[PDB]
């Protein structure tokens, strides 16, 4: 009985690490790209208005 | 030197989270080890006790 | 048994870093093109300021 408890606690640390290694890069690099697409909006706004 | 005693079945490769550590236990300390190897640390795979070779 | 089922359980988490990267494959490319679709704000501004020329 005690052997099956830890092997399901193996599944717990799998799910805990799956929270940590599959959501953190989804948090940062979407926010990194949020500055990057905001950079792309700001870089054209100078150029298109000098044509105006 | 362990150059002859090895077997690839006696290790868990592919390092992601697991590793086989080679532990040596005296013969008089056999019964105390097979009850405690689960609880010498946290998150021990609690069934991996297999005697590779002996002296 | 024990060890073979543990490596297949890892492949759920090993495909989750692919789900992590596909969420940074699609989101990186899809919103770049609506950051390319903002030139339509420059298309409507130019013809509207062409009326200021007119």
PDB file of C-alpha atoms in Angstrom:
ATOM      1  CA  UNK A   1       0.000   0.000   0.000  1.00  0.00           C
ATOM      2  CA  UNK A   2       2.845   2.374   0.850  1.00  0.00           C
ATOM      3  CA  UNK A   3       4.602   1.614  -2.451  1.00  0.00           C
ATOM      4  CA  UNK A   4       1.590   2.760  -4.489  1.00  0.00           C
ATOM      5  CA  UNK A   5       1.332   5.975  -2.445  1.00  0.00           C
ATOM      6  CA  UNK A   6       4.739   7.325  -3.473  1.00  0.00           C
ATOM      7  CA  UNK A   7       4.417   6.270  -7.119  1.00  0.00           C
ATOM      8  CA  UNK A   8       1.267   8.406  -7.266  1.00  0.00           C
ATOM      9  CA  UNK A   9       3.245  11.078  -5.433  1.00  0.00           C
ATOM     10  CA  UNK A  10       5.622  10.694  -8.370  1.00  0.00           C
ATOM     11  CA  UNK A  11       2.673  11.851 -10.501  1.00  0.00           C
ATOM     12  CA  UNK A  12       2.193  14.808  -8.138  1.00  0.00           C
ATOM     13  CA  UNK A  13       5.704  16.191  -8.662  1.00  0.00           C
ATOM     14  CA  UNK A  14       5.296  15.601 -12.401  1.00  0.00           C
ATOM     15  CA  UNK A  15       2.159  17.764 -12.374  1.00  0.00           C
ATOM     16  CA  UNK A  16       3.807  20.372 -10.138  1.00  0.00           C
ATOM     17  CA  UNK A  17       6.829  20.650 -12.432  1.00  0.00           C
ATOM     18  CA  UNK A  18       4.478  20.726 -15.437  1.00  0.00           C
ATOM     19  CA  UNK A  19       2.995  23.830 -13.829  1.00  0.00           C
ATOM     20  CA  UNK A  20       6.489  25.292 -13.533  1.00  0.00           C
ATOM     21  CA  UNK A  21       8.134  24.277 -16.828  1.00  0.00           C
ATOM     22  CA  UNK A  22       5.098  24.873 -19.067  1.00  0.00           C
ATOM     23  CA  UNK A  23       3.554  28.136 -17.747  1.00  0.00           C
ATOM     24  CA  UNK A  24       6.537  30.342 -16.845  1.00  0.00           C
ATOM     25  CA  UNK A  25       7.942  30.741 -20.366  1.00  0.00           C
ATOM     26  CA  UNK A  26       4.332  31.297 -21.434  1.00  0.00           C
ATOM     27  CA  UNK A  27       4.211  34.190 -18.944  1.00  0.00           C
ATOM     28  CA  UNK A  28       7.510  35.947 -19.702  1.00  0.00           C
ATOM     29  CA  UNK A  29       7.889  35.559 -23.468  1.00  0.00           C
ATOM     30  CA  UNK A  30       4.319  36.686 -24.135  1.00  0.00           C
ATOM     31  CA  UNK A  31       5.101  39.765 -22.049  1.00  0.00           C
ATOM     32  CA  UNK A  32       8.456  40.081 -23.829  1.00  0.00           C
ATOM     33  CA  UNK A  33       6.612  39.976 -27.158  1.00  0.00           C
ATOM     34  CA  UNK A  34       4.078  42.466 -25.752  1.00  0.00           C
ATOM     35  CA  UNK A  35       6.947  44.956 -25.543  1.00  0.00           C
ATOM     36  CA  UNK A  36       8.169  43.705 -28.930  1.00  0.00           C
ATOM     37  CA  UNK A  37       4.886  44.270 -30.771  1.00  0.00           C
ATOM     38  CA  UNK A  38       4.566  47.580 -28.941  1.00  0.00           C
ATOM     39  CA  UNK A  39       8.042  48.337 -30.262  1.00  0.00           C
ATOM     40  CA  UNK A  40       6.840  47.528 -33.788  1.00  0.00           C
ATOM     41  CA  UNK A  41       3.883  49.909 -33.367  1.00  0.00           C
ATOM     42  CA  UNK A  42       6.145  52.702 -32.116  1.00  0.00           C
ATOM     43  CA  UNK A  43       8.841  52.284 -34.781  1.00  0.00           C
ATOM     44  CA  UNK A  44       6.474  52.800 -37.717  1.00  0.00           C
ATOM     45  CA  UNK A  45       4.682  55.751 -36.076  1.00  0.00           C
ATOM     46  CA  UNK A  46       7.786  57.908 -36.462  1.00  0.00           C
ATOM     47  CA  UNK A  47       8.389  56.828 -40.061  1.00  0.00           C
ATOM     48  CA  UNK A  48       4.860  57.101 -41.479  1.00  0.00           C
ATOM     49  CA  UNK A  49       4.327  60.598 -40.080  1.00  0.00           C
ATOM     50  CA  UNK A  50       7.501  62.005 -41.653  1.00  0.00           C
ATOM     51  CA  UNK A  51       6.017  60.977 -44.990  1.00  0.00           C
ATOM     52  CA  UNK A  52       3.029  63.029 -43.861  1.00  0.00           C
TER      53      UNK A  52
ATOM     54  CA  UNK B   1      36.919  -1.033 -10.170  1.00  0.00           C
ATOM     55  CA  UNK B   2      33.498  -1.802 -11.640  1.00  0.00           C
ATOM     56  CA  UNK B   3      34.571  -2.228 -15.259  1.00  0.00           C
ATOM     57  CA  UNK B   4      33.128  -5.754 -15.526  1.00  0.00           C
ATOM     58  CA  UNK B   5      30.083  -5.726 -13.214  1.00  0.00           C
ATOM     59  CA  UNK B   6      27.980  -3.203 -15.153  1.00  0.00           C
ATOM     60  CA  UNK B   7      24.617  -3.760 -16.831  1.00  0.00           C
ATOM     61  CA  UNK B   8      22.546  -1.080 -18.558  1.00  0.00           C
ATOM     62  CA  UNK B   9      19.351  -2.622 -17.135  1.00  0.00           C
ATOM     63  CA  UNK B  10      20.513  -1.767 -13.582  1.00  0.00           C
ATOM     64  CA  UNK B  11      20.414   2.000 -14.214  1.00  0.00           C
ATOM     65  CA  UNK B  12      17.714   4.474 -15.186  1.00  0.00           C
ATOM     66  CA  UNK B  13      19.255   6.696 -17.851  1.00  0.00           C
ATOM     67  CA  UNK B  14      17.672   9.671 -19.666  1.00  0.00           C
ATOM     68  CA  UNK B  15      18.461  12.150 -16.834  1.00  0.00           C
ATOM     69  CA  UNK B  16      15.251  14.251 -16.831  1.00  0.00           C
ATOM     70  CA  UNK B  17      14.375  13.846 -13.122  1.00  0.00           C
ATOM     71  CA  UNK B  18      15.688  10.391 -12.104  1.00  0.00           C
ATOM     72  CA  UNK B  19      19.028   8.662 -11.490  1.00  0.00           C
ATOM     73  CA  UNK B  20      20.202   5.291 -10.118  1.00  0.00           C
ATOM     74  CA  UNK B  21      22.652   5.678  -7.245  1.00  0.00           C
ATOM     75  CA  UNK B  22      24.864   2.700  -6.422  1.00  0.00           C
ATOM     76  CA  UNK B  23      24.504   2.029  -2.695  1.00  0.00           C
ATOM     77  CA  UNK B  24      26.389  -0.698  -0.836  1.00  0.00           C
ATOM     78  CA  UNK B  25      24.842  -2.262   2.279  1.00  0.00           C
ATOM     79  CA  UNK B  26      26.378  -4.811   4.699  1.00  0.00           C
ATOM     80  CA  UNK B  27      24.809  -8.270   4.859  1.00  0.00           C
ATOM     81  CA  UNK B  28      24.012  -7.926   8.571  1.00  0.00           C
ATOM     82  CA  UNK B  29      22.269  -4.607   7.817  1.00  0.00           C
ATOM     83  CA  UNK B  30      20.074  -6.114   5.079  1.00  0.00           C
ATOM     84  CA  UNK B  31      16.689  -6.220   6.828  1.00  0.00           C
ATOM     85  CA  UNK B  32      17.070  -2.738   8.325  1.00  0.00           C
ATOM     86  CA  UNK B  33      17.870  -1.344   4.871  1.00  0.00           C
ATOM     87  CA  UNK B  34      14.955  -2.927   2.976  1.00  0.00           C
ATOM     88  CA  UNK B  35      12.513  -1.338   5.438  1.00  0.00           C
ATOM     89  CA  UNK B  36      14.190   2.087   5.484  1.00  0.00           C
ATOM     90  CA  UNK B  37      15.354   2.718   1.877  1.00  0.00           C
ATOM     91  CA  UNK B  38      11.932   4.245   1.175  1.00  0.00           C
ATOM     92  CA  UNK B  39      12.355   6.778   4.005  1.00  0.00           C
ATOM     93  CA  UNK B  40      16.040   7.753   3.917  1.00  0.00           C
ATOM     94  CA  UNK B  41      14.934  10.659   1.713  1.00  0.00           C
ATOM     95  CA  UNK B  42      11.842  12.213   0.201  1.00  0.00           C
ATOM     96  CA  UNK B  43      10.312  11.074  -3.114  1.00  0.00           C
ATOM     97  CA  UNK B  44      12.168   7.740  -3.222  1.00  0.00           C
ATOM     98  CA  UNK B  45      10.944   5.250  -5.830  1.00  0.00           C
ATOM     99  CA  UNK B  46       9.890   2.749  -3.171  1.00  0.00           C
ATOM    100  CA  UNK B  47      10.338  -0.560  -5.017  1.00  0.00           C
ATOM    101  CA  UNK B  48      13.769  -0.369  -6.704  1.00  0.00           C
ATOM    102  CA  UNK B  49      15.604  -2.609  -4.205  1.00  0.00           C
ATOM    103  CA  UNK B  50      17.434  -5.199  -6.311  1.00  0.00           C
ATOM    104  CA  UNK B  51      20.711  -6.839  -5.296  1.00  0.00           C
ATOM    105  CA  UNK B  52      23.165  -6.475  -8.186  1.00  0.00           C
ATOM    106  CA  UNK B  53      26.011  -8.574  -6.749  1.00  0.00           C
ATOM    107  CA  UNK B  54      27.352  -9.528  -3.325  1.00  0.00           C
ATOM    108  CA  UNK B  55      30.548 -10.319  -1.484  1.00  0.00           C
TER     109      UNK B  55
ATOM    110  CA  UNK C   1       5.910  -2.174 -13.719  1.00  0.00           C
ATOM    111  CA  UNK C   2       7.497   0.830 -12.024  1.00  0.00           C
ATOM    112  CA  UNK C   3      10.219   2.396 -14.167  1.00  0.00           C
ATOM    113  CA  UNK C   4       8.651   2.010 -17.625  1.00  0.00           C
ATOM    114  CA  UNK C   5       5.406   3.743 -16.623  1.00  0.00           C
ATOM    115  CA  UNK C   6       7.421   6.600 -15.100  1.00  0.00           C
ATOM    116  CA  UNK C   7       9.170   7.528 -18.356  1.00  0.00           C
ATOM    117  CA  UNK C   8       5.868   7.528 -20.257  1.00  0.00           C
ATOM    118  CA  UNK C   9       4.417   9.831 -17.591  1.00  0.00           C
ATOM    119  CA  UNK C  10       7.331  12.193 -18.307  1.00  0.00           C
ATOM    120  CA  UNK C  11       6.270  12.351 -21.961  1.00  0.00           C
ATOM    121  CA  UNK C  12       3.108  14.129 -20.833  1.00  0.00           C
ATOM    122  CA  UNK C  13       5.364  16.778 -19.294  1.00  0.00           C
ATOM    123  CA  UNK C  14       7.879  16.456 -22.147  1.00  0.00           C
ATOM    124  CA  UNK C  15       5.122  17.347 -24.598  1.00  0.00           C
ATOM    125  CA  UNK C  16       4.072  20.192 -22.288  1.00  0.00           C
ATOM    126  CA  UNK C  17       7.251  22.123 -23.101  1.00  0.00           C
ATOM    127  CA  UNK C  18       6.140  21.669 -26.696  1.00  0.00           C
ATOM    128  CA  UNK C  19       2.778  23.106 -25.629  1.00  0.00           C
ATOM    129  CA  UNK C  20       4.799  25.863 -23.957  1.00  0.00           C
ATOM    130  CA  UNK C  21       6.673  26.496 -27.209  1.00  0.00           C
ATOM    131  CA  UNK C  22       3.635  26.187 -29.502  1.00  0.00           C
ATOM    132  CA  UNK C  23       1.984  28.835 -27.343  1.00  0.00           C
ATOM    133  CA  UNK C  24       5.088  30.901 -28.172  1.00  0.00           C
ATOM    134  CA  UNK C  25       5.101  29.748 -31.798  1.00  0.00           C
ATOM    135  CA  UNK C  26       1.534  30.795 -32.621  1.00  0.00           C
ATOM    136  CA  UNK C  27       1.218  33.880 -30.375  1.00  0.00           C
ATOM    137  CA  UNK C  28       4.532  35.255 -31.658  1.00  0.00           C
ATOM    138  CA  UNK C  29       3.527  34.963 -35.321  1.00  0.00           C
ATOM    139  CA  UNK C  30      -0.204  35.729 -35.188  1.00  0.00           C
ATOM    140  CA  UNK C  31       0.032  39.093 -33.425  1.00  0.00           C
ATOM    141  CA  UNK C  32       2.986  40.157 -35.552  1.00  0.00           C
ATOM    142  CA  UNK C  33       0.594  40.160 -38.520  1.00  0.00           C
ATOM    143  CA  UNK C  34      -1.977  42.353 -36.792  1.00  0.00           C
ATOM    144  CA  UNK C  35       1.029  44.495 -35.952  1.00  0.00           C
ATOM    145  CA  UNK C  36       1.376  44.320 -39.719  1.00  0.00           C
ATOM    146  CA  UNK C  37      -2.347  45.062 -40.097  1.00  0.00           C
ATOM    147  CA  UNK C  38      -1.907  48.433 -38.367  1.00  0.00           C
ATOM    148  CA  UNK C  39      -0.604  49.798 -41.688  1.00  0.00           C
ATOM    149  CA  UNK C  40      -4.316  49.947 -42.580  1.00  0.00           C
ATOM    150  CA  UNK C  41      -4.484  52.772 -40.029  1.00  0.00           C
ATOM    151  CA  UNK C  42      -1.824  54.436 -42.187  1.00  0.00           C
ATOM    152  CA  UNK C  43      -3.799  53.640 -45.353  1.00  0.00           C
ATOM    153  CA  UNK C  44      -6.894  55.395 -43.998  1.00  0.00           C
ATOM    154  CA  UNK C  45      -4.899  58.311 -42.563  1.00  0.00           C
ATOM    155  CA  UNK C  46      -3.116  59.056 -45.851  1.00  0.00           C
ATOM    156  CA  UNK C  47      -6.285  59.351 -47.946  1.00  0.00           C
ATOM    157  CA  UNK C  48      -7.963  61.329 -45.153  1.00  0.00           C
ATOM    158  CA  UNK C  49      -4.992  63.712 -45.101  1.00  0.00           C
ATOM    159  CA  UNK C  50      -5.120  63.682 -48.903  1.00  0.00           C
ATOM    160  CA  UNK C  51      -8.362  65.600 -48.372  1.00  0.00           C
ATOM    161  CA  UNK C  52      -6.316  68.077 -46.324  1.00  0.00           C
ATOM    162  CA  UNK C  53      -4.130  68.387 -49.413  1.00  0.00           C
ATOM    163  CA  UNK C  54      -7.282  68.646 -51.536  1.00  0.00           C
TER     164      UNK C  54
END
